Amino acid sequence: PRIDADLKLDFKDVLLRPKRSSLKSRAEVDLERTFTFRNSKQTYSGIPIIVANMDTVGTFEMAAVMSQHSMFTAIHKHYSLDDWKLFATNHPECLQNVAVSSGSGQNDLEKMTSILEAVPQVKFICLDVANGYSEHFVEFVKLVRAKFPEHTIMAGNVVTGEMVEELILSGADIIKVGVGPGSVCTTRTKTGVGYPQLSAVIECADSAHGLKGHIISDGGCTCPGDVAKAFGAGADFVMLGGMFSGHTECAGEVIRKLKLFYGMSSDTAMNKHVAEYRASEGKTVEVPYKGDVENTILDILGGLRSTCTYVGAAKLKELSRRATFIRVT
Amino acid sequence: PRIDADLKLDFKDVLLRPKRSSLKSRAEVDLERTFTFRNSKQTYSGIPIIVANMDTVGTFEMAAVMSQHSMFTAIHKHYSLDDWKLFATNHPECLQNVAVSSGSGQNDLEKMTSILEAVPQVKFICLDVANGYSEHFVEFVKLVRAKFPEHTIMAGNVVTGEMVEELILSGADIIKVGVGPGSVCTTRTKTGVGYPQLSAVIECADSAHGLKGHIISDGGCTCPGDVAKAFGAGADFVMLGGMFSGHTECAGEVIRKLKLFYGMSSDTAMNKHAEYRASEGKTVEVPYKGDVENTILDILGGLRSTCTYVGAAKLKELSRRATFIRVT
Amino acid sequence: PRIDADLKLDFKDVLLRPKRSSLKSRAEVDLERTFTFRNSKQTYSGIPIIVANMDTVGTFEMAAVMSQHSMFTAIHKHYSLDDWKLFATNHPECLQNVAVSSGSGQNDLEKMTSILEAVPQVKFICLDVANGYSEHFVEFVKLVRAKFPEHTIMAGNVVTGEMVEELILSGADIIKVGVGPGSVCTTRTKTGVGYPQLSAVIECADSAHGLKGHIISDGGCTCPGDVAKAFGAGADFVMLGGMFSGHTECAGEVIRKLKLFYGMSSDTAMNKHVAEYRASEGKTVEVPYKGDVENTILDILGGLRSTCTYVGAAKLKELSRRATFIRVT
Amino acid sequence: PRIDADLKLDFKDVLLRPKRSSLKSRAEVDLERTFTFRNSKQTYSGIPIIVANMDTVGTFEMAAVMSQHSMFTAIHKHYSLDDWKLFATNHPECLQNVAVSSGSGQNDLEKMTSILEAVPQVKFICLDVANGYSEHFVEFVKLVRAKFPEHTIMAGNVVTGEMVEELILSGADIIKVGVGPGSVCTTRTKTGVGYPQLSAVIECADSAHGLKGHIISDGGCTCPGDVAKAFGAGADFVMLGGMFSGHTECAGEVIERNGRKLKLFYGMSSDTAMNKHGVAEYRASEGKTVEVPYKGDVENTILDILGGLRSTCTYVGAAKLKELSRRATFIRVTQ
Ligand SMILES: Nc1nc2c(ncn2[C@@H]2O[C@H](COP(=O)(O)O)[C@@H](O)[C@H]2O)c(=O)[nH]1
Ligand SMILES: Nc1nc2c(ncn2[C@@H]2O[C@H](COP(=O)(O)O)[C@@H](O)[C@H]2O)c(=O)[nH]1
Ligand SMILES: Nc1nc2c(ncn2[C@@H]2O[C@H](COP(=O)(O)O)[C@@H](O)[C@H]2O)c(=O)[nH]1
Ligand SMILES: Nc1nc2c(ncn2[C@@H]2O[C@H](COP(=O)(O)O)[C@@H](O)[C@H]2O)c(=O)[nH]1
Ligand SMILES: [K+]
Ligand SMILES: [K+]
Ligand SMILES: [K+]
Ligand SMILES: [K+]
Predict the structure, then answer these.
(1) Fold of A1-329
(2) What is the rounded distance in angstroms from the CA atom of residue A300 to the CA atom of residue A288?
(3) Which CATH code fits B1-328?
(4) Residues in CB range of D86: below 8 A, 6 or more apart
(5) Is A221 one of the annotated active-site residues of the chain?
(6) From chain C, which residues contact B within 8 Å (Cβ)?
(7) Is the CATH number 3.40.50.300 carried by domain D1-335?
């Protein structure tokens, strides 16, 4: 029973230091990123901010707006094959900016397979388990890789670099990083297992990039600054659920105006459809109705352009290279 | 007046790191543990989570439910001989999963003696004092050991390894660890004496296991994760009061729906029935949680998940595979 | 502008470790202490817990109860000479357990002088200034010492050992230690000057005892545990205001039932009568009505007996010797 | 992506240690400070506490009070030329105690130029950008210096000493230090960029004084203790917005909700400011809009600030505010 001597930090524990540059204004900043993935060998270009594949936020209506801003949507796994066919028919321009989501079960794999065959324009797969450290997940990734050699594979979640390497070597292109921090995640309270989001991203990013692989910082961001910190720590993408919750484009009706936001393995999800899809049985919360998601997007992108300006990054690419954190109280 | 340079952590200061394993699902995990005790030489098998011997939670009704899940109940010391006789008559299947509780007083010892002679199926004794570091307690343990050489003895409470050794060498099989962190304990506020629960368990577990003895992490767990951290830190058992408070099976009626939960040495206990525990405990109104079944399932479920995530197929393996990280 | 590398702790930051002993029960513990003062050469015996010389708590009615428990009362400086005469007439058994209080003003010195000459049984003087680090205070101590060679002199406040030494060498017997922690003190908010109470007492106690002098831990205790930690850190006496506030014996009527409790240099005290008596213009608070102080005394003494039991101290004298602190979160 | 090993502290993390001295009473302390600026070569005398150039606090009505106490007011940049002319007409005694404010835009520079030409008695300029680390701001400072060689230039905001040096070498006399801590600043939340205010001042004061330059601690003070701490850490001036917010002298009428008197206080680059006025990238973040409790007349707040800083100086042994930093020793605390 060892205690790690190293203190692990989250986003609230740090700030980014401003640095000298020739960038006056935030509009000068290019947030678009180009990635060539390790295993799929595919090339991606866009603003690497991903809507999480949760029931309320990972929707086709959200994708349609996100895609307008060159942003990415991981679509929740509970849409039917027909729903995807309709989306492809009506929103072909978005298909480059979505991922189809699957658990490690036989049925999920079948359903996903059918969607991918029916919609060849979808080139991203998002794989999620309760235990991303399992040998059974490693072998599921190997299988999906072999079944879809040209699809880009997102796989999670982990918080440590050895499992990043193993999953990348096993066929995943992009590793989803985060266990505990998620707004409705409850691992810490229900299992005492987890990891601070910053330190997770810091360590895992190193490990991924040593293999020419990529990571998603998955969860923990409560504001655009955290999104900026995630990127500064080395995250190739940033995945957000809570910050996108509560908008008009979110699934659900308005309930003080509120929208319901619930974990992917929540009791609500369990009743609606998910047992060990995520590491914990997530919370169900009522979030304040934020209105149209446009305005939230603009605030996130704008704040990230400002961060880049202030650290001297003309491109989001350069952020990590120019990110220096200070520890605060 | 020295200050210890080492910072002592509680559960909220740490997390458990996940580790690579071949365990997909939490249902795979075996929470049952088999212990052979050092002094009693008895063997126990069950899920080593214990309901604290407090008035509201350490009840026969609670024990009847706990025993169905192979879990243990330390029965509060205020039940009569007749009440035990009735419980033995009606719930013989439970007797292997309960402990009879006693203070260090002559009257307590006599009453416990009568209960154990009347109910030979009860093979666990729980002893509790205000000052678990006193020589008087050491001698009382020696006496109880001598009086009941084949009963397994739980004795507390302490927070440091030297006293763990002393109590084990004096005849206790299992040492109850924790002074301060208890939900209704008030030692820190009233005496300024105490110890963080994680650091207590870390140090005390080593000390006990060096003698082939055992410990109970007693108090401080506010959620199943803490229960998991306790086990990861080396606790052989984990004892819970606050987390079992507020249920239908708890002593008391419903009072917002609430149940009353009070310290073993509280003013409420003193009026209802002095230095049983290290502090005069709090009396709190806790939210009515409903049936305890659901709570048990949450605790066990979360602990199975923990074990899955660190690669422990059995609860035995937890501490071996527990690596903690310090957090803010 | 240097930052001290050593983190300074308060009471909340530590716990006392229990230790092996032959003490079963708390009733076995003797809280009485016997002190022989350095400069006055007087001897004191009692339970070295002092009611602070504040308007509401440092009263004759309070002293009459405290004396029954062999405890001390520092009487506020706003009682008249006649009030003292009457208290000597009616409560002669208390006079050994009270101190007369004075500021460093000429009028305060005269009034105190008249009280001490009229009541020769009062053998303790309590001196207080806004700036206990002042050469002006050093010289006032010298003067009081010379005027009253056989009276025991409490002087404050400080938080550091070099001033402890200077004040003792100047003729004070007992140094009041604490600047900031007081329940209605506001130095931190109003001046940013202060010192954590535990670290104050640790460093100051050493410094005092090196000269065969004594200290009072003045302020910061919110509960009997803190009182125990004060003593554990080396405090010869412990002085309490907030903990004694709110009782039937306290000056004021009942106002939820409440009693008013206000700083010695508060706006309330300024209007009632102080300017630079204490380091900050103190708060005025409404405290919950606690009832009769007997009960509070019993809780304080009882908890301190328990502490001594748990560390193996049969006498309060032995506490610091047997006090080991652990740092907590 | 490096993490700085050094923990950076804010005001809450420290206390000032009292020290032995001959000063009994706080009235003995002289808070007035004399500065001779590096680039402007001007000499200033006063109590080096500045009202921030925000909409509600940096007013002419506030300046007229502040000046009475030899205190300084940075006037917000949205006053007209005529408004300044009227202020000069009516309050000539204050003009030495105010600064005219400008962003780095062409229109701001021209308006400020007109004000300075019309009011020659105003000898302080306050320059503020979103990114004080920009080469475009360095250049703007060089141009203002050249345009007004005898005016004293305030320029910000930064948090690090290399930018202090650059800005001073480029012609600013006084560097405004602080990014993050401001009451209605939101950089940390919106951008994740920022710096603790104490560590800012410590580092940046050293850097400025090495050049015989000066700094303002801009933002973060929530009480007079913080103000004292700022000065203790090396700040030549201390600039305050939230602490002056909510008074009778402040722009705006009293608000009345739920048995509560309040005044509105908003960021210089807030949505409120954007709607009311050319503030887009004036400051590093789009600032908050808050309702602050009505505090009454500012006189009383001033007296609390000055009184508490006199006390601080007494307790550390500083007979002059000048001596504070020399006699400031901080201790690290927990709460
Ligand atoms: N452990 C756990 N994580 C969840 C659950 N639901 C969503 N999450 C995680 O939290 C991430 C979103 O983080 P957020 O932005 O909500 O803080 C998701 O991408 C997902 O990885 C759940 O029920 N349990
Ligand atoms: N010191 C003290 N501890 C108590 C009292 N009542 C209960 N406890 C402790 O707190 C434990 C339960 O802690 P919890 O599970 O509520 O954190 C009990 O098993 C017991 O050891 C009391 O009155 N005083
Ligand atoms: N600075 C300052 N300290 C006060 C004032 N009133 C009481 N105190 C301090 O607080 C002490 C009592 O602290 P407490 O026990 O309430 O924490 C008093 O003995 C005195 O030293 C005041 O008005 N100003
Ligand atoms: N970054 C940013 N800072 C602001 C804004 N409005 C005011 N400030 C800053 O906050 C300072 C006042 O801080 P305070 O003393 O109120 O904590 C100003 O001098 C200025 O630096 C804003 O909209 N954005
Ligand atoms: K969470
Ligand atoms: K407790
Ligand atoms: K205080
Ligand atoms: K701020």
Answers:
(1) TIM Barrel (3.20.20)
(2) 18
(3) 3.20.20.70
(4) none
(5) no
(6) 9, 11, 14-26, 202, 205, 223-229, 232-234, 299, 303-304, 306-307, 309-312, 320-321, 323-329
(7) no
